[PDB]
Design a protein around this nucleic acid. Structure first.
Lengths: 140, 95, 125, 213, 68, 141, 192, 208
RNA sequence: GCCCGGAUAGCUCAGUCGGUAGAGCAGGGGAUUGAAAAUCCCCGUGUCCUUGGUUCGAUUCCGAGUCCGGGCACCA
RNA sequence: GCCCGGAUAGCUCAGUCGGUAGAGCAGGGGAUUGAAAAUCCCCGUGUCCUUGGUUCGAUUCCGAGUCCGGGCACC
RNA sequence: GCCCGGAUAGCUCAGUCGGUAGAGCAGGGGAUUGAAAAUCCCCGUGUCCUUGGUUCGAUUCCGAGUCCGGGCACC
RNA sequence: GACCGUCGUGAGACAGGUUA
RNA sequence: GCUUGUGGCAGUCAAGCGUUCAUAGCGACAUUGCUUUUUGAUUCUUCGAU
RNA sequence: AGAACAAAAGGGUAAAAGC
RNA sequence: CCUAAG
RNA sequence: GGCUGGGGCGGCAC
RNA sequence: GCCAGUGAAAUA
RNA sequence: GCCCAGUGCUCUGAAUGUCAAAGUGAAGAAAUUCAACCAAGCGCGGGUAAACGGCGGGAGUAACUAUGACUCUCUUAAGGUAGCCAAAUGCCUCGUCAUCUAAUUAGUGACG
RNA sequence: GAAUGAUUAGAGGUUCCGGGGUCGAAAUGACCUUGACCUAUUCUCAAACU
RNA sequence: CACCGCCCGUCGCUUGUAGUAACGAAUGGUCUGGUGAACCUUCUGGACUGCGACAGCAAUGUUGCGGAAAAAUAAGUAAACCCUACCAUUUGGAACAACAAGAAGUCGUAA
RNA sequence: GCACGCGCGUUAC
RNA sequence: GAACCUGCGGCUUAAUUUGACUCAACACGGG
RNA sequence: GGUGGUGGUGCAUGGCCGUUC
RNA sequence: UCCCU
RNA sequence: ACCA
RNA sequence: CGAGGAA
RNA sequence: GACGAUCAGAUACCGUC
RNA sequence: GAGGUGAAAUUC
RNA sequence: GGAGGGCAAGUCAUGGUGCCAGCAGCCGCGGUAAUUCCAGCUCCAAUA
């Protein structure tokens, strides 16, 4: 049969934890899963790996596929619960989550997955540095 | 310029004589390196510095080598007989 | 070696037959198309008769020097009568009079059919 | 496996028996191989004995036919029939061309086909066991049936098949296995490269096996 | 242009002036006549809002008699 | 209070102020800067001159017309003058090289609304008032 | 007694299993059980009358729809009757219980609404209604018949017959009708 | 041009410079008859001709000028019906010029003239009696042109003209050319015809 | 003069360790369209450079030929 | 004067191997506009400079020439 | 100064291997407008610079002068 | 000897211009 | 230094200009020449001093 | 014998030397 | 340049 | 390299 | 097994 | 000012192709002759001009007339930017207009 | 006013294929003007023509 | 005359204009360094002449004294002229250039 | 009136 | 788009009467 | 000096009609 | 229904 | 008017 | 003319 | 300033440096 | 795969 | 010296002219039926 690799410990009452990082830009979306120490990468699915048109590299659809794609890979890691660290290029950019955000989570919950605690880790700065554009910014 | 592979060009050998269809290819080349007396002695310089030999060789060619026609019967059993057609450029049987 | 429709002479005897009364004896009638027969059998004018004789004098008096006296008319509605062949009648169209040499073939046909009433179109721009 | 053990298939394998002493009657050994495994047509043989040396062993009815004159080319002997009114209906196909060209030996008939042999008569039969070989087909199929009956040598054609011999009971070793090789020529090697072209085989005499590879 | 100088006047038909029937009194007399033809009590009599234009008599022979 | 100062001791101030703030008047600024003396007539009311040539000028804006004009040479001044010849046939009397008497048109500056760069009127030909030449019963040479 | 269709087709031979179509079809009513598909009814008056129309009357209507050639129900009632005989001679089933199925299948369940903003032509996911679904189904079915029916000796009563059959089967290779039925959903499933 | 020094003599056999001297600077007088051509061969009779008495090379261009002033008057006081000025010299011999700064040089062609043998006829024309002095005075012109020269001679023939042959053609009243033998009389001499003649004809051939 | 790589659809190029020839673009047909794109389906053509041998057969395997591409070394 | 380079549709310039010749712009006709632009559909165009010669066939390959171009003329 | 060049209506300007003379603008008569610009048809106007030659005839093909118009001028 | 332009990779080279 | 094309300079013929007339004053075309302070050819004399 | 005989030009060539 | 352009 | 109306650029009567 | 053998090619 | 394509310089860089001597393998009976891999270098990739040096060309293109901020184009890195002149660089050239002279192939001031 | 191959110029065709005109004008007979080949003439030439 | 509305600039065209600064010239005025007519005064000078005494009665003559013309003199007032600086008022100048005004010129469209 | 450019329509594949 | 029909433009013509021109001209002036 | 005029000005006008509707 | 007119 |  | 492009 | 795109034009309104 | 736009494109 | 307005005075169905000649202090007149031009008539103003 299958040769799983999740630690040698099962139990339909023993929860496994995986920290899922999700960055949702207005261009691309990321979905990452890693040890609760976040120093060893496991699963990594981005909208780009999911569609052809660069404009769709964001999409709600790309979030579904990249999301469900990870859950499958996760049942094999023997992990059922996921901690969520949600972000969105905080830096000096629209500190607002993208679109493929509420879409990704939703997909993980539906396709089974148990959800641990949920954080928002969009890096808000104390100061700032001259943003996109300048003085007047995107005009038109 | 259109030759015709094999054609009864009388010939002999002998131990044959008379005619005999001859499969006639043209002649190629042949390496020498490290056998030729040309070498056996022409290995020099003499020797902490050199140059070459009086004929070596930049002259002025002719832009037309020659056909090394190599007629050769099969009944005569021998022997691949060379001929000499001169006019280039050209090529075997067309025609 | 060429001939003519129904015999130019038979008709001169057919038209000027025993009763050479009405320009178009009932004889010539059998020859013409319904439209023409209609008209003659209906009510043909007399003027068409004095015009007739006007060609008459033109055809004889003229020497064999083949120089016919052109007869002028507006009666474009006239249907060429057998004896009308040979003379050159000038027919009005709109501007002036048209001189046409009457051949045997143009009989039973409206005298107007030859006096071109308009100059068709040439072009460019 | 072309190794020392050849004389283990020969010398060490020449008195195996299956009972007591070693009997009291004559012997019967050889050296098994084949013909060329080519396809019994294009290229697989030529001329030259080993030997070898043998003949039938059991039956010899092979193949020879074509016209109404090919029957007598199998009357004072014994062969198969190609028929006349069959090359336009059923003298070849699978179990047909077989029949005439499918016996054991090979073929020793003549030639006559025309525009029909790329998938029927001459065709379907080749690697099966025949496809127009060299049997001096001109005077008949008997004199060249010295290459199709006895002596031999060992005409190896059709499907595998061949022969071998050297001594009688016991008196061969290096020249026993090296007699088996000697019992091989234009069947073990030939012109441009031919020292080997197979995988394995068999041999013995009557005892038990030979090479245990 | 130039040669087009006085095009108008040259083209104008010289009409003559009505040789004075009698005379035009020049002096206190003229000022008198005027006083009479307009500010004499018979005109200041009728409405000061309905009295005529000192030149409605544009020289109209038809309205010239209707008034007098 | 307003800008002006109301002191009995500050008369001087008000005085100088008026003399100063007064330059803002063109009418003042004009005569004050001997400007009148620099014009073609040199202040004068009229000027004599010789006809340099009769030229015509085009009307401006809503008007389109050939105005009659004479280019004159003033005597002691010696300047090129643009002079509009009045009424109808007028230019028909001005012979080239005759003596002409010119005067301005409504306040020396803007020409009549119609004219372009003309600032003068012609009143005499060979010393004969134009009006005089304009009415037959008067004069002609 | 029960008035069979065209005189030989029991109406009660069918039932609408799916609840969707139950009120958006005619087989079910007492008033619907007609001998002839001609009622010169007054449907198309209120804003949902169309419902109460004996499913086949609808078919006939949608059928006499090509300009010059059409506008005469008289005939069309025929083309539909023969077509029913012909559908029967092949699956010997109550041809209403065939046409009916076909109606339920050939109706797209999804469409895309063209919503363009300043030149760009965008689309969205839209779920197709029932009344609209049936309408599309018939319109579609018939639409196709004429397709081949043109310069062909094949007749409408034949083309149509051959259609109603495959349209019930969902045979995506034999029903110009169901082709769109699938494509419309597919393309629509893309724009969504 | 280069003057007339490469002028009248010899100093060189005759380099008619055709096939062998290819580059003959093309001629100068591509005229020859310039006049009342297609003439009558009766009509414009009595010819006066211009003979040159002096083995010279009446140059190229020169012969031209001849023609020029020739026609000039010919016509200018007698008409296009009056002349016919048969060229009658004509200009072969391509002469040459000269130009390793003095070492062996042959000529490169340099203009074609012609050899008036002393007695030869040059630019000689022909016209009717009433043209005499006309023609005569005119040809004078030329003599004054063209490295002269000069016959301005009055003539006869033969029959390149009138031309005495006067008593002759004035005698061949009856006929024109052959004559010749006596046989296939296809020059309508008059009058019968063939029959009679062909009688007399062999009637003598037989006398032998 | 040696030493590597190639030769395939009109273009650019995949390609069994011998059984089928395939993408991408161009081109074309259609839906959509203010315009043009981008979209979105459906197609089009192949001695797989040539010549022989291996094999039941061979784009493929090997030799040879021509061509183009790479490279590296000399040159009296 | 010597050695070079072209020329092809109305224009600016592609292409050929000896069989075919093109594009952009212009232009002609409809469409949008109230009307012009723009934009959208449709469309037609060639002595391939003249010239002899070769060839079965020449815009193309030779030979001569015209034009418009550029480059040398040093001791 | 010698080497080419243009001369054509009111002013600026082209010509089968001669035989005929042109647009443009001025221009007056219209179409057009509300009137006018613009625009589109029409008029008109001359040895095509003076001589000599070539031809059936020359504005043109020739030859010289001619006026104005670019390139050449001790040691 | 020394400027520049202009050709040349360089050395230099200009019947080019400039100065002692 | 030859030679003189090219430069320069004169000359014959007389169609023309010169309003009337070819020559007072000039002369197309065509043609004969002189000139050696142009220029061009040529290489004889002089790099074993100009 | 004005053509043709690869190609330059000339010679040659007619039941051929051309086809 | 011609396997026939021998 | 050479032949060259002196050398040269050019051309090949190399 | 093989004489039968199909298929892309039959083996102890 | 703008040009890194050219020549030079110079960087960890290029997933791959040459590339010598020893060293290795294969074949003969060896001599010897075929092999495979193989440092640099090369070629591929990048930066680099206060490094050598570079800095285009023709067509159309109204409101007498000539005209180009216009666009069309074919095009090599880039297509001379500020600035500056008949200047010690300018061919024609004694440039054209002034200015200084009675007079200017000189001067100077302009203009491209 | 001989072969060939060049070149002048007009003549005569009781002559044929076309560009200009005519009674003219669509198988117009008939003459007509430039070419197009004869026919007796004219002019001047040839290393690779006689 | 109401967006097929208004409207801006480059260049061009049409009709025109000579400003501010500098320089040139003219007139007038002042400064700097010199030449210096004329005249008041001054020191001279002393023809000519008046007086007294002596040579004669007288014309004349000697001398003493006094007035006194020309000449010459120094300091002075200082005309004119020149040179060196500066002021004022007028007036002048050109191709190309420049400025002014206008438009359904040309290219686009700023507002 | 016809080289053509538009606009209602009639008949039809 | 097609052939006819009819109106408008255009170009012809002796002459092709003329009105009307984005809906608010063109089978409309009962054309 | 009139009659009459499908001759000119719909921007000289009545009357009427279309359009905004 | 207010996207288009 | 566009939507169907 | 074989159901008709931009509209 | 160098680049992408947008445009009939963009060394401009967006985008990469 | 990022990034960036209405779409994409040089960019990583 | 004027008679559209300011600025007192023509509502002449007046003649000529036709953005021409010209008027006009400033508004503005004038492009075939001008209340401002040329002129007649009649008017107004100040009046030697």
């Amino acid at each position: 049969e299958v040769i799983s690799y999740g630690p040698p410990n099962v139990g339909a009452n023993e929860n496994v934890f995986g920290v899922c990082h999700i960055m949702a830009t207005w261009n691309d979306t990321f979905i990452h899963v890693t040890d609760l120490s976040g120093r060893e990468t496991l699963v990594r699915v981005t909208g780009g790996m999911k569609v052809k048109a660069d404009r769709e590299e964001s999409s709600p659809y790309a979030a579904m596929q990249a999301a469900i794609d990870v859950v499958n890979r996760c049942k094999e890691l023997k992990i059922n619960a996921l901690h969520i660290k949600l972000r969105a290029k905080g830096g000096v950019e629209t500190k607002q989550p993208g679109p493929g955000a509420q879409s990704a989570l939703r997909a993980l919950a539906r396709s089974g997955m148990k959800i641990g605690r949920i954080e928002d880790v969009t890096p808000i700065p104390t100061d700032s540095t001259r943003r996109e554009g300048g003085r007047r910014g995107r005009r038109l | 310029v259109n030759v015709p592979k094999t054609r009864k060009t009388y010939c002999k050998g002998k131990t044959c004589r008379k005619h005999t269809q001859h499969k006639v290819t043209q002649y190629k080349a042949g390496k020498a390196s490290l056998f030729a007396q040309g070498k056996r002695r022409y290995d020099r310089k003499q020797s902490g510095f050199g140059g070459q030999t009086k004929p070596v060789f930049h002259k002025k060619a002719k832009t037309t080598k020659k056909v090394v026609l190599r007629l050769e019967c099969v009944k005569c059993k021998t022997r691949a007989q060379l001929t000499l057609k001169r006019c280039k450029h050209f090529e075997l049987g067309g025609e | 070696f060429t001939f003519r429709g129904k015999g130019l002479e038979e008709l001169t005897a057919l038209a000027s037959g025993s009763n050479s009364e009405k320009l178009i004896s009932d004889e010539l009638a059998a020859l013409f198309d319904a439209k023409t027969r209609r008209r003659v059998k209906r009510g043909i004018s007399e003027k068409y008769a004095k015009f007739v004789n006007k060609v008459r004098r033109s055809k004889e008096k003229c020497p064999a020097g083949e120089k016919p006296v052109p007869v002028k008319t507006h009666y474009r509605s006239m249907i060429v009568i057998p004896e009308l062949v040979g003379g050159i009648v000038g027919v009005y169209n709109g501007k002036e009079f048209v001189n046409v040499e009457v051949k045997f073939d143009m009989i039973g046909k409206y005298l107007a059919e030859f006096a071109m009433t308009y100059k068709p179109t040439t072009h460019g721009k | 496996i072309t190794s020392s053990q050849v004389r283990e298939h020969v010398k060490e394998l020449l008195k195996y028996s299956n009972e007591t002493k070693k009997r009291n009657f004559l012997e019967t050994v050889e050296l098994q191989v084949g013909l060329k495994n080519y396809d019994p047509q294009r290229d697989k043989r030529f001329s030259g004995s080993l030997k070898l040396p043998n003949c039938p062993r059991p039956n010899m009815s092979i193949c020879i036919f074509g016209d109404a004159f090919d029957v007598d080319r199998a009357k004072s002997c014994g062969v198969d029939a190609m028929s006349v009114d069959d090359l336009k209906k059923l003298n070849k196909n699978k179990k047909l061309i077989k029949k005439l060209s499918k016996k054991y030996n090979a073929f020793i008939a003549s030639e006559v086909l025309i525009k029909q042999v790329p998938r029927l008569l001459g065709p379907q039969l080749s690697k099966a066991g025949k496809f127009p070989t060299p049997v001096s087909h001109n005077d008949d199929l008997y004199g060249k049936v010295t290459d199709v009956r006895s002596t031999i040598k060992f005409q190896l054609k059709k499907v595998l098949c061949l022969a071998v011999a050297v001594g009688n009971v016991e008196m061969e070793e290096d020249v026993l296995v090296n007699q088996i090789l000697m019992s091989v020529n234009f069947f073990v090697s030939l012109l441009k490269k031919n020292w080997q072209n197979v995988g394995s085989l068999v041999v013995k005499s009557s005892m038990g096996p030979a090479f245990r590879l | 242009t130039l040669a087009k100088a006085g095009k108008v006047r040259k083209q104008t038909p010289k009409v003559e002036k009505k040789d004075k029937p009698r005379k035009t009194p020049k002096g206190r007399s003229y000022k008198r006549i005027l006083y009479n033809r307009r500010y004499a009590p018979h005109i200041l009599a009728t409405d000061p809002k309905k009295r005529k234009s000192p030149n409605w008599h544009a020289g109209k022979k038809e309205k010239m008699d209707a008034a007098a | 209070g307003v800008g002006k100062p109301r002191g009995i001791r500050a008369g001087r101030k008000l005085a100088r102020h008026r003399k100063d703030q007064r330059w803002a008047d063109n009418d003042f600024n004009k005569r004050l800067l001997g400007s009148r003396w620099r014009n073609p007539f040199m202040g004068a009311s009229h000027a004599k001159g010789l006809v340099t040539e009769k030229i015509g000028i085009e009307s401006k804006q809503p008007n389109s017309a050939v105005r009659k004009c004479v280019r004159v040479l003033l005597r002691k001044n010696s300047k090129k003058i643009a002079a509009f010849v009045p009424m109808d046939g007028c230019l028909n009397f001005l012979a080239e090289n005759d003596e002409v008497l010119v005067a301005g048109l409504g306040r020396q500056g803007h020409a009549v609304g119609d004219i372009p760069g003309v600032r003068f009127k012609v009143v005499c030909v060979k010393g004969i008032s134009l009006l005089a030449l304009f009415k037959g019963k008067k004069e002609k040479r | 007694t029960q008035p069979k269709l065209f005189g030989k087709w029991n109406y009660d031979e069918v039932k609408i299993q799916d609840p969707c179509f139950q009120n958006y079809i005619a087989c079910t009513t007492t008033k619907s059980q007609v001998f002839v598909p001609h009622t010169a009814g007054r449907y198309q008056v209120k804003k949902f009358r169309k419902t109460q129309c004996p499913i086949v009357e609808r078919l006939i209507g949608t059928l006499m729809f090509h300009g010059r050639n059409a506008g005469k129900k008289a005939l069309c009632i025929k083309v539909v009757k023969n077509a029913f005989e012909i559908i029967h001679l092949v699956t010997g089933r109550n041809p209403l219980e065939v046409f009916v199925g076909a109606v339920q299948n050939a109706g797209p369940r999804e469409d895309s609404t063209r919503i363009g903003t300043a030149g760009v032509v965008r689309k969205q996911a839209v779920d197709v209604a029932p009344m609209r679904r049936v309408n599309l189904a018939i319109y579609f079915i018939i639409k196709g018949c004429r397709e081949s029916a043109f310069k062909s000796m094949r007749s409408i009563a034949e083309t149509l017959a051959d259609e109603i059959i495959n349209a019930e089967k969902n045979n995506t290779q034999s029903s110009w009708a169901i082709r769109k039925k699938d494509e419309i959903e597919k393309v629509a499933k893309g724009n969504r | 041009r280069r003057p007339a020094r490469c002028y009248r003599y010899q100093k060189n056999k005759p380099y008619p410079k055709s096939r062998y001297n290819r580059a003959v600077p093309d001629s100068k007088i591509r005229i020859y008859d310039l006049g009342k051509k297609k003439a009558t061969v009766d009509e414009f009779p009595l010819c006066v001709h211009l003979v040159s008495n002096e083995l010279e090379q009446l140059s190229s261009e020169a012969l031209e000028a001849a023609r020029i002033c020739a026609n000039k008057y010919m016509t200018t006081v007698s008409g296009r019906d009056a002349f016919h000025l048969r060229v009658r010299v004509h200009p072969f011999h391509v002469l040459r010029i000269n130009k390793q700064g003095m070492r062996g040089a042959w000529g490169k062609p340099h203009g074609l003239a012609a050899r008036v043998d002393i007695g030869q006829i040059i630019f000689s024309v022909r016209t009717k009696d009433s043209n005499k002095d006309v023609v005569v005075e005119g040809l004078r012109r030329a003599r004054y042109k063209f490295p002269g020269q000069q016959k301005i001679i009055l003539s006869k023939k033969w029959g390149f003209t009138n031309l005495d042959r006067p008593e002759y053609l004035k005698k061949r009243e009856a006929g024109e050319v052959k004559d010749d033998g006596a046989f296939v009389k296809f020059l309508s001499k008059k009058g019968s015809l063939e029959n009679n003649i062909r009688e007399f004809p062999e009637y003598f051939a037989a006398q032998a």
